UniProtKB/Swiss-Prot annotation:
Homomultimer; forms homodimers and homotetramers. Interacts with RAD51. Interacts with ORC2 and ORC4. Interacts with RHNO1; interaction takes place during mitosis and promotes POLQ recruitment to DNA damage sites. Interacts (when phosphorylated) with TOPBP1 (via BRCT domains 7 and 8); promoting POLQ recruitment to DNA damage sites. This is DNA polymerase theta. Keywords: Acetylation, ATP-binding, Chromosome, DNA damage, DNA repair, DNA-directed DNA polymerase, Helicase, Hydrolase, Multifunctional enzyme, Nucleotide-binding, Nucleotidyltransferase, Nucleus, Phosphoprotein, Transferase. Highly expressed in testis. It comes from Homo sapiens (Human). GO terms for biological process: base-excision repair; DNA damage response; DNA repair; double-strand break repair; double-strand break repair via alternative nonhomologous end joining; error-prone translesion synthesis; negative regulation of double-strand break repair via homologous recombination; protein homooligomerization. A motif (DEAH box) lies at residues 150-153. The chain holds residues 67 to 891 of 2590 of the full protein.
């Protein structure tokens, strides 16, 4: 009665966009989450709910509550680029009927529109923290109205999860310096034990629920028997048609689900098991339906299965060999070895029902929202080690489709030996959230950085302000070291002290580090290395420049050293000079092949990182030399997933080093670097830099249009559409040495986009020419 959406004083225009697919009434917990306290007035809120319970609607009503009531700008923060991109389009579609402009600041991407001409900016953690820093230097902190944090449990421990605290703490420190509404915080996560601590730290009202529209049946199978969390038998399983192999009834379980016209997610430890399992299942699906690499069977969807394989074909990766076998039978795999474009296709196919069986890794469990009737976990041993509890809850959470299934079933297959360990996961619970700013060592990276941001930014100047900040931390909410970090910044010339007793100021090295979004620990080695490059620099190739923008803070692949030594001998003299100039000794490469001795316990054995870095720069060199992804894979021995993940990392890092050089006055160095951020992003040469401004144009399409007479956007705006269409048809990779009168493919949507409607080769060509024209006019 009262939770009817029409009784909340909702604008009429918006109320219908929600009703497009469901959403006429809310939930018991969503109405209570809004009404209790002074939350709807602007008070901060930290709420928890089970996965697939409707956490999105609660935040959205609060965001619209501020954008339209306070006429201020909102900030939506998401962990990954893939989940951030998924959220942007979902929010764009909802917030357009009232003239509300919504874009995003994600990974290497940047908005065409000014921050002043937005309403809601969608960011990742790294990019959001930088944007906040943008607002401090310009004192435009007054623009920001609220921040929404998704996955609040990443506050605890992550490669970047600590940035979430510095971000929030900075907001808590600033809002304290003005101490009617100020800055509202809406955080949400899974059930945390110390969740009450987070609500108190942020002075937020709390809400927690266990509600879930579809009941989840977590279970564990040992042999034929299936038990619940209390080891009580709930089903004695017997396989309808036996097949050979390992067979812990894995194929029979998948078959049972499909026959009831449903879909199943099958999680496997390694990337190789997923492909092997997708192959076995798809192979058995061929024999069993008929009782004894094709076209999809004739149903209502014959057209869409064909559209999917063709979209895969017209990609920079091509159509995977294993997928060509499996996809025709609604079977596929999904891991980090695949490119981000392949994974966007499969996730969409599975979400539409085109793919009924999806054998995935742990990458998907933390990825986008993707539900299924039955979830199967192959083993409690992932990567040779027992499975993490959070990963388990993320896998089994995808069981049960709201509005479709009566229940969601989860099966964890085990042996008698790993029997005890499996039950531990079903009964297990999440660990308490750590501060990631902790003291053995008096100093720590996260703390040094937090202090640098507030001093250089100019919101903490004196010594009293520092301890005022210490009160606002999540670390102090749980109930010196700060003074140690300040001295560290003094010793390394990051900060200044003047004689009005004891006031701290930023140096040029300080102001440069902040604007570059670089870590103070990393800045020291970078600053010395750059000065080293400017004393003796090679300009005949782009290798030495690439080395300066080649990131080595994390391993992106397992390098085969014997292959490396083989490429070393074949390496031209111009690139050997660059190798020597960097630190690459041939003796060390030999000592890598002969014995797999990593050593690296000693700190001066950063010698290892150097050879790893030079190996990586070679890969980046071919990448911006427009070498096919398939050649690079065979040449170096790394998958297309690792390469693409690397270039998006190097594109970002290249921008940092460029800014770092600009703030230090190093013009000559800046001048050389300022061309590789764009080239690393798309993986192109200098000529294609202009073409790739068009959204639909990537490296391959840009090359074939360049080789056909269209060099610029200007050349592309006067262009004849049907000619562009023909040129596009020529860039496609076919298995036979390719490149029936079918008047039925005049409508086949075989071209993929972002936030996509299926595009035909004709519409894509017409969109490219239309977009080229729109850009050319804005240039005058
Ligand atoms: N109050 C609601 N009433 C009906 N359906 C909802 C409601 N909130 C969300 N949904 C739908 O349920 C699905 C899952 O909810 P979601 O908000 O994704 O939960 P979570 O964010 O915890 O995964 C979404 O696709 C959404 O369209
Ligand atoms: K593009
Ligand atoms: Mg969520």
């Amino acid at each position: 009665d009262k939770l009817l959406l029409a009784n909340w004083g909702l604008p009429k225009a918006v109320l219908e966009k929600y009703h497009s697919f469901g959403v006429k009434k809310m939930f018991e917990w969503q109405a209570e989450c809004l009404l209790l306290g002074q939350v709807l007035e602007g008070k901060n809120l930290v709420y928890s709910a089970p996965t697939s319970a409707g956490k999105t609607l609660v935040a959205e009503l609060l965001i619209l509550k501020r954008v339209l009531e306070m006429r201020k700008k909102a900030l939506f923060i998401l962990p990954f680029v893939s989940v951030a991109k998924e959220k942007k389009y979902y929010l764009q579609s909802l917030f357009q009927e009232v003239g509300i402009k919504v874009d995003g600041y994600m990974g290497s991407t940047s908005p065409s529109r000014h921050f002043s001409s937005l309403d809601i900016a969608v960011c990742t953690i790294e990019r959001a923290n930088g944007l906040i820093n943008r607002l401090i230097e310009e004192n435009k902190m007054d623009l920001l109205g609220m921040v929404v944090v998704d996955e609040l449990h990443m506050l605890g421990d992550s490669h970047r999860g600590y940035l979430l605290e510095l971000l929030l703490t900075k907001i808590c420190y600033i809002t304290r310096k003005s101490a009617s509404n100020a800055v509202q915080i809406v955080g949400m996560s899974a059930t945390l034990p110390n969740l009450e601590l987070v609500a108190s730290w942020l002075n937020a009202e709390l809400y927690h629920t266990d509600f879930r529209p579809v009941p989840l049946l977590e279970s564990v199978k040992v042999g034929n028997s299936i038990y619940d969390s209390s080891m009580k038998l709930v089903r004695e399983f017997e396989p309808m048609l036996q097949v050979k192999g390992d067979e812990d009834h894995v194929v029979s379980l998948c078959y049972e689900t499909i026959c009831d016209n449903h879909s199943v997610l099958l999680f496997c430890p390694s990337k190789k098991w997923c492909e092997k399992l997708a192959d076995i299942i798809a192979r058995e699906f061929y024999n069993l339906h008929h009782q004894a690499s094709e076209c999809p069977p004739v149903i209502l969807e014959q057209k869409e299965l064909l559209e999917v394989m063709d979209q895969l074909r017209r990609l920079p990766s091509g159509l995977d060999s294993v997928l060509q076998k499996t996809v025709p039978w609604g079977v596929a795999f999904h891991h980090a070895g695949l490119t981000f474009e392949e994974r966007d296709i499969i996730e969409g196919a599975f979400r539409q029902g085109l793919i009924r069986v999806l054998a995935a890794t742990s990458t998907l469990s933390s990825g986008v929202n993707l539900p299924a009737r039955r979830v199967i976990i192959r083993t409690p041993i992932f990567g040779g080690r027992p499975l993490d509890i959070l990963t388990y809850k993320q896998m089994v959470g995808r069981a049960g489709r709201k509005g479709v299934d009566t229940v969601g079933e989860s099966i964890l297959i085990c042996k008698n030996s790993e029997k005890s360990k499996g039950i531990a996961l079903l009964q297990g619970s999440l660990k308490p959230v750590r501060s990631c700013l902790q003291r053995g060592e008096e100093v720590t990276g996260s703390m040094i950085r937090a202090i640098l941001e507030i001093i250089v930014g100019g919101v903490a100047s004196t010594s009293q302000d520092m301890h005022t900040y210490a009160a606002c931390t999540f670390l102090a909410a749980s109930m010196g070291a700060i003074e140690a970090c300040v001295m560290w910044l003094l010793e390394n010339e990051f900060i200044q002290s003047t004689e009005e007793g004891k006031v701290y100021h930023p140096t040029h090295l300080g102001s440069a580090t902040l604007s570059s979004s670089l870590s103070p620990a990393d800045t020291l080695d970078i600053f010395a290395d750059l000065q080293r490059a400017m004393k003796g620099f090679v300009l005949e190739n782009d290798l030495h420049i690439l080395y300066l923008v080649t990131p080595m803070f994390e391993d992106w692949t397992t390098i085969d050293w014997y292959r490396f030594f083989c490429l070393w001998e074949k390496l031209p003299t111009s690139m050997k000079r660059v190798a020597e100039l960097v630190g690459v000794e041939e003796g060390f490469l030999a000592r890598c092949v002969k014995g797999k001795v990593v050593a690296r316990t000693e700190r001066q054995h950063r010698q290892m990182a150097i050879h790893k870095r030079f190996f990586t720069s070679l890969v980046l060199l071919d990448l911006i030399s427009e070498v096919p992804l398939r050649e690079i894979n065979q040449k170096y021995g790394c998958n297309r997933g690792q390469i693409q993940s690397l270039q998006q990392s190097a594109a970002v890092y290249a921008g940092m080093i460029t800014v770092f050089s600009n703030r230090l006055g190093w013009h000559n160095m800046e001048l050389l670097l300022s061309q590789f951020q764009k080239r690393l992003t798309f993986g192109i040469q200098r000529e294609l830099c202009d073409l790739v401004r068009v959204s639909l144009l990537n490296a391959q399409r840009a090359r074939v249009l360049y080789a056909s007479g269209f060099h610029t956007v200007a050349d592309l705006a006067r262009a004849n559409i049907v000619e562009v269409e023909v040129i596009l048809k020529n860039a496609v990779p076919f298995k036979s040495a390719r490149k029936e009168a079918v008047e039925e493919r005049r409508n086949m949507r075989t071209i993929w986009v972002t936030g996509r409607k299926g595009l035909t080769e004709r519409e894509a060509a017409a969109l490219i020419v239309e977009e080229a024209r729109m850009i050319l006019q804005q240039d005058l």
